[PDB]
Every structure is written in C-alpha cells, then in structure tokens.
Design a protein around this ligand. Structure first.
Ligand SMILES: Cc1cn([C@H]2C[C@H](O)[C@@H](COP(=O)(O)OP(=O)(O)OP(=O)(O)O)O2)c(=O)[nH]c1=O
Ligand SMILES: [K+]
Ligand SMILES: [Mg+2]
Length: 425
DNA sequence: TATGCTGTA
RNA sequence: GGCCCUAAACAAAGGUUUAGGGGUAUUAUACAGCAUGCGGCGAGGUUCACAAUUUGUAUGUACUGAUUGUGGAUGAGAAGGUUGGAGAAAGACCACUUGGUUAAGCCGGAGGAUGUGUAGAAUUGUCGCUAUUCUGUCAUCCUCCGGUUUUGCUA
C-alpha cells in the first residue's frame, strides 16, 4: 500500500489507551459500516492549558493579572481514524452545498482553499478599500464549540447528508461526538503510577484493558457530557461539524448583507460585516435577534464598530480594525502587537536557556582543565532571526511582501539589534 | 538551585 | 458507572434496570507555511574497568609503579537544576522539577529635542555553495493619546 491514495490516514504521536495501527488494518476496518456500528469507542483524554495576560485598570492606573483556561480533549488512535474517514466523507457533501449557495468566497476557516490568514485579511481590507466610505462591524461568539446544541447539529447533519434521519454508523459517530466521555490525563497518570514528566518510558499504551476496566472506570475517572450542548475541542471532525452547524445562518447573513449592498465573511466564530455607514447601529441587534435560533449567543464584550471616512484623499478610520492578526487603519496595514510580544518573550527565553547551557558545560570543562568556549549562536540565529528559513520573521516578511506594506518592515527592523543586544547582555 | 519547534481559529 | 456483545424482566423510546464478558502494535485539532538550508574539516587525545608483561619490594601468594592491548564513555557547535537512584565511569539513562516578586515592556500617531550621512554591509566553530535582511518617511531620548501583555530582578 501507499499513503498517497488515502489522504485521511495520519499517524498520531500521543499516548492513549490503545496503540497505533498500520494503514492496512485501518483501511479494512473503517471502510466497513458493520464495524463502525459495533465499535467500542474509548473515552477522550483531557487537560487544560494555563495562560496569563496583563490588564491595566483605567480608573486606578494599576496593573492586574488575569487568567484563561482552555479545555483540550483528544481521542484514541482508531477513533481518530474513524473520525478522519467520516470527515473525508462529509467534506464533499458540504463543499457541494457551498457551491449550490455561492458561499465559496464567504466561508474561510477549515477549508482546503490553498490560502492563509494573510490572503483572507488582504481580501477583507481590499473590500473595505474598494467600497469607500463604509462601516466594518466585527462580532464573536462566546464558547462556540462548547455551546453547539445537539439537536440542531443533528438536523444540520441530516441536511448535509440529505436524509430525514441519520444512518446507524453516522448515528453511532454522532452519539460518540455529542454525549462524549473523557478522562483527566493527570488523574489517570496518578492512579496508574505513570510519571507525568516522562510518560512514554517502556510503554506503548497508557494501560492494559483490565487496568482500564478496574483502575480507570471503577474509581470514577470517566466523566460524561450529560448536558444537551457542546462538542470536544481536538477531534478531527469537530471543525467540520462547527462549519456544518452554521450553514443556514451563513446563507441568511449573506442574504442580509447582499440586500444592503454589503459583504459578509466568517472565519470560525469571527464574523465581519462591511456595510454602508447608515446600517452600523441596527446590524448588531439584527444579528443577535437571528442568531438565537442556533442558541449560541454573542460575546458583546468583544464587539467593535469602525467607521471609515476620506481625509481629503486618504481613507481613515476612527479607530484601527483588527482582523486575523493584522491591524488596518484605512491605508496602512500593521502586525498585531500580541505576536510581537510573544516573539519577544520566546526570544528572551531562548537566549537565556542558551546562556544557562553555556554556563553548564563550561563548569565541566573547568573540572577537566579544558579551555572554555563562548556561546554557540547557530540555533539562536536560526530560530529568532531572518537567517533561519521558518520562524516568526519569515512570516513577517511574507506578510510585508503579500500586503505590499512598508509599515510591517519598519516593525520588524529593530528585532535584529534586540537579538544582538540580548546575546551581548 | 533552575527547564525543550512559525501563522490563524 | 461512559462504549460494545450475550441473556433476562417491564412496555413500545433511535428505551430503562439487572447478571456475565471485552478493548486488534508489526501530552490536542483543522487549514497554511517549510522541508536549526546543504556538503566538507575539527579528533591529537582524555577518563573508567579488565587482561598480558616487567618494575619497587615482601613470602605458586601480597600488593604496587609503568608500558602494551580489549571494551564502556567522551570533545562537535548549546535540553537548565538536585550530588536523589542505578552504575566501574559518563557530558548518557531513571526519579522530582514549567517557581516567586514586580510595574512597567512593545506597536502606532502627535509635540519636542539630540547626534550627524547602487553599490556597499551583515549572518553560523570554520570553509564553500546558497539563502535572507539593511542602506534619510536616518538613529537615540523625554512628555501626551489610542492599542496590547509583557519587562526587570531572583531561585
Ligand atoms: C485558539 C484556539 C482555538 N481553538 C478552537 C476552539 C474554539 O472553540 C474555537 C474558537 O476559539 P476562539 O474564538 O479563538 O476563543 P474562544 O471561542 O474559546 O473564546 P475565548 O477567547 O474567550 O476563550 O477554535 C482550538 O482548538 N485551539 C486553539 O488554540
Ligand atoms: K557545518
Ligand atoms: Mg468563541
């Protein structure tokens, strides 16, 4: 066999309750609907990622620390092959329904369009530029993957496959993905005696099946989503189901924008409306009235309305507009500051770890009487400077090249001297 | 006595 | 205790409850970018343990200095700490380890000051082939306005 004929097959690298299968067994298993109906689905493994960001209180001029947690959940190997195979099945029907409704240019995320966020941001900013005096309204959903109603998702899934009810293997996958069960990874590693720091030492599965059935299940580690909403974040099929969920709302929003001479774009839960200025007040309530049929609700705290006028030749905004990592002021395109702050943090951490390792090995050379050596800089320049082939700066100069922006090049210019001064520190 | 791979969501 | 299979009871749901059994090696996702760029040269030794001799002495034995071989580790282009295990040793493996404290750091635009300038320059231990970046809307500093989440010190 050869992997090119089967594009859905990807070999997963993580530990789980099972261990990865070959291509030859996987193809023979997932292509039989009789196996899918009688499949014994394993629970997801779960963990949460910790993040801090700083906020300045405007009433006090004192800094505050805020916290955000994201529930990660990922499935076992054979279940991942089943989800990838049925995502490959559903993708063709969804892309036919895109072309039948002329939604090809409006729906952006999770589609194999051979384009990146730079081209989508360029399309949006060029649309604003071509339209002239207009208003851009940006919207967002609060907890998108955690609030998908199961019956609405079932109705959209039947509409995409073209039936009044799900067939048995499609219904089995629907039951597995909606009323999902999950096991916390750290509690499993505590109970099984697996080290949290080096879990892969001398094992291929997390545990034998009898240890699963006694230690994992009977100690109450399996938690079942008995609520009527949400899908897990990290399955191969979840992004496609999030696109299938929104389809009739995307048709209605395209009709709403096209009636008023406007445009509509959606990238996951990031909706952008570009409309004439007289519609800027009414739109934000009109979208919220229509979206309650899907039972997801708007994140009112993130909503931004920006108005564009000509300053005697130049289109200027009242405040700059952020979309997919770029900042648009009306004629100028800039990089979002969060990526530059992330780059500064990663660069300083990397140079500090390199200096720590340089201090580490020189103490060994001192003991043997060998002469000391200076800091090796090949890995430092490869990851944090323009000389390396794939880093943050290569993305920045690609963005400057595509969007024809000298302002992005002015942002990236002091980073070389900052890397050199961080090395010389 | 101090910790390990771009971009968007 | 979720999931699947078998059997039983109660009615008629894409059902509940009970009893028994099971989980197929050969640290997240989806699109996009890109395939720590590529190829030579460092390398003489050092350390640890055995083995054959001969060397300073005692009585086949006790050690012990040095040659000479066999094997483990190691210099090499930054994966940090603890003298905690294993070990003959290891810069390798196993175990624990992703803290605290800060109030400012970055991006853009206005007011100022301050220093002067079409081929050349910069980039890895080193060399060669590439590849990328900069070059008066010049560079540094101090107050405002808007955005953003990092910055310094210390284990
Ligand atoms: C950022 C991010 C998003 N996603 C998916 C899951 C999210 O439901 C979806 C959109 O996420 P976001 O809109 O980026 O964030 P959010 O919806 O969770 O809201 P908040 O920022 O307040 O937390 O994209 C990931 O799977 N991994 C990621 O790292
Ligand atoms: K080299
Ligand atoms: Mg959201």
């Amino acid at each position: 066999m050869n992997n090119d004929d089967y594009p859905w097959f990807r070999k997963r690298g993580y530990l789980h309750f099972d261990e990865p299968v070959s291509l030859k067994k996987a193809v023979k298993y997932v292509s039989s609907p009789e196996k899918i109906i009688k499949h014994s689905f394993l629970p997801f493994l779960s963990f949460e990622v910790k993040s801090f960001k700083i906020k300045k209180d405007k009433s006090t001029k004192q800094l505050s620390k805020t916290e955000k947690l994201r529930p990660i959940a990922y499935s076992s190997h054979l279940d991942s092959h089943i989800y990838a195979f049925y995502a490959e099945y559903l993708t063709g029907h969804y892309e036919l329904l895109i072309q039948e409704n002329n939604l090809h240019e409006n729906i952006l995320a999770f589609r194999s369009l051979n384009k990146s966020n730079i081209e989508f941001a360029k399309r949006a900013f060029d649309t604003i530029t071509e339209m002239g005096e207009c208003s851009a309204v940006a919207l967002d959903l609060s907890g998108f993957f955690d609030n998908l109603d199961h019956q609405i998702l079932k109705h959209q899934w039947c509409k995409v496959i073209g039936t009044e009810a799900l067939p048995q293997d499609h219904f089995a996958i629907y039951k597995s993905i909606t009323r999902y069960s999950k096991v916390d990874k750290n509690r499993a590693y505590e109970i099984l005696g697996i080290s949290k720091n080096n879990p892969k030492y001398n094992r291929r599965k997390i545990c034998t099946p009898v240890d699963f059935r006694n230690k994992i299940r009977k100690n109450g580690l399996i938690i079942v989503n008995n609520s009527q909403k949400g899908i897990p974040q990290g399955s191969p099929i979840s992004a496609l189901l999030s696109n299938i969920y929104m389809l009739d709302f995307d048709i209605e929003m395209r009709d709403y924008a096209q009636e008023r001479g406007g445009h509509y774009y959606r990238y996951c839960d990031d909706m952008l409306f570009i409309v004439p200025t007289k519609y800027n007040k009414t739109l934000a309530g009109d979208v919220a009235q229509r979206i309650k049929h899907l039972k997801v609700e708007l994140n009112t705290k993130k909503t931004e309305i920006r108005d564009f006028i000509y300053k005697d030749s130049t289109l200027v905004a009242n405040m700059p507009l952020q979309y997919l990592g770029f900042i648009f002021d009306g004629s100028n395109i800039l990089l979002r500051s969060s990526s530059l702050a992330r780059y500064s943090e990663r660069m300083k951490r990397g140079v500090r770890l390199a200096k720590a390792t340089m201090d580490s090995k020189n103490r060994i050379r001192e003991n043997k009487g060998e002469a000391l050596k200076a800091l090796f800089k090949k890995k430092l320049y490869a990851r944090y400077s323009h000389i390396g082939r794939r880093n943050f700066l290569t993305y920045g100069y690609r963005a400057a090249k595509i969007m024809n922006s000298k302002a992005i090049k002015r942002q990236l210019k002091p980073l070389q001297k900052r890397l050199e001064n961080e090395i010389l520190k």
